[PDB]
Paper text:
The transaminase MvTA demonstrates transaminate activity toward d-fructose 1, and the resulting 2-amino-2-deoxy-mannitol (ADM) 2 undergoes dehydrogenation under the enzyme GutB1 and spontaneously cyclizes to produce the valuable azasugar mannojirimycin (MJ), which serves as a precursor for 1-DNJ.
A mutant M9 with significantly enhanced activity and thermostability has been successfully obtained and crystallized for structural resolution. Moreover, the mutation of K142P notably heightened the rigidity of the loop region (137–146).
Numbering used by the authors:
A (entry chain A): 19 to 137, 151 to 186, 198 to 337
B (entry chain B): 19 to 65, 71 to 135, 151 to 184, 198 to 247, 251 to 337
The structure:
Amino acid sequence: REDTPAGSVIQYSDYEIDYSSPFAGGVAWIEGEYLPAEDAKISIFDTGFGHSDLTYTVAHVWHGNIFRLGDHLDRLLDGARKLRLDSGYTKDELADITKKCVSLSQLRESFVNLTITRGTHQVYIYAIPYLWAFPPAEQIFGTTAVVPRHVRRAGQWGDLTAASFEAKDRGARTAILMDADNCVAEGPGFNVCIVKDGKLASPSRNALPGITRKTVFEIAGAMGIEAALRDVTSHELYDADEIMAVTTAGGVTPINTLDGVPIGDGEPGPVTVAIRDRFWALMDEPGPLIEAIQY
Amino acid sequence: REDTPAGSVIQYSDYEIDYSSPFAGGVAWIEGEYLPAEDAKISIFDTDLTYTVAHVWHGNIFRLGDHLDRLLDGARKLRLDSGYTKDELADITKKCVSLSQLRESFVNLTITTHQVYIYAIPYLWAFPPAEQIFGTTAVVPRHVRRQWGDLTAASFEAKDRGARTAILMDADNCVAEGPGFNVCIVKDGKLASPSRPGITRKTVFEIAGAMGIEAALRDVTSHELYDADEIMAVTTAGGVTPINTLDGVPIGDGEPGPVTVAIRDRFWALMDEPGPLIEAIQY
């Protein structure tokens, strides 16, 4: 189930999956049917994947709790209305379906996807094992990044793969891509936040579907930290007090070094750590942000 | 197989489909395998891509050469491996149409590990044959400017206003497109279409050039649309469709314009005329 550092804010649930169920380990709901993830197949005529005509969001489940399911459905449905996608289901129906996908999977730790496409409009929901852009150890102890020399954004998951390969060839774990106008764009599968003089900044691109950075901004807010979506300059990145990766697939990752240069002392920054540890604490704290899945 | 108007330039091949083939009526090719259309499914996890749309009419596939050139050119951008060559995709494409037994077919090539999907299904109409011949009604939406979100909203406003279709403007008050088509206007024996996955428009411009009609890709203003002599829709799914009225007011004499009719009748004749553009399909 992936090992996590002992005594760390990151711990998997302790429990037994009954694999006699064909649903164990991954459930996808397609066309009114809950089916094992392995057998979940979508028509080639779905003009969503065929012609990028879809809305989607990604959620997560941790310790049997699904995080901010309501906010995810509002965001998915908002997107549905802008694209004139009528799912045919209500918010409550989509909620019960998402929760049943997780329940039938038996996963206490799960990566969840909700998609609405133009098929007659189609809804696809899946719950599969929890996904890491960075392993648990790196979430705790921090990772290493470079700015690619051989790929920029404009001011394409191909760029992101190349950026990642170049990082690994230069002996770092990940890339922070810049754009044409020398502003921070993003990482392969994450957004970047910088901390400078107790303020937090993240690019305005908002490519990622998830709600993790919104949670980071709200956590920063409740910590008295000014947090802003805006253009982040090359200068701001290389002069940042802290840099962090933010994504649904692993949460908040300290970035210890950029182009082999330590950021602060070359260890996770104090604001990165406070936000990260709060994020994981939220997964066990009764309140509006979580619902327990019934297994 | 969809009725067409009697005596019109639009007539389906006359033939019976052998449904003893599981491939009859529509076929998909997915990474090595030919499948009945209905069986053409991919993993949800598999669900960055380029694609082109083409058509077959009277057993002839239209401009597959130029479609494949367009498709591969697109593949190098987005860093997507072709996996196969042009001659190979060409064979696979003609084989899908052949196996489908469809003389009239809508065909799609997509490149998205690399995945290549090809299919041939029954021919798709943006506008029914009756409107391809007798023309249709349009409005400029007041609540949507220039995403199938916009074009679906345009379409909803058009129907709400009693019209068959919408012609969207951009924030610059220039003509963008309709839902599923490019707009061409005729003014003073000149053809114009807005400077914005089908070779149907390029085909209209080459037909227009060959009739001694200037044709320009440029900015068309709202005022040029309302003042046009003729308005037509252009798309792979149905070809060239006259627009007889705009905001309830007839364009011209309230019937298909003569350039529209000339270009339209020439496009349908291209399918039946042997040459570089059309290749007969071995069924």
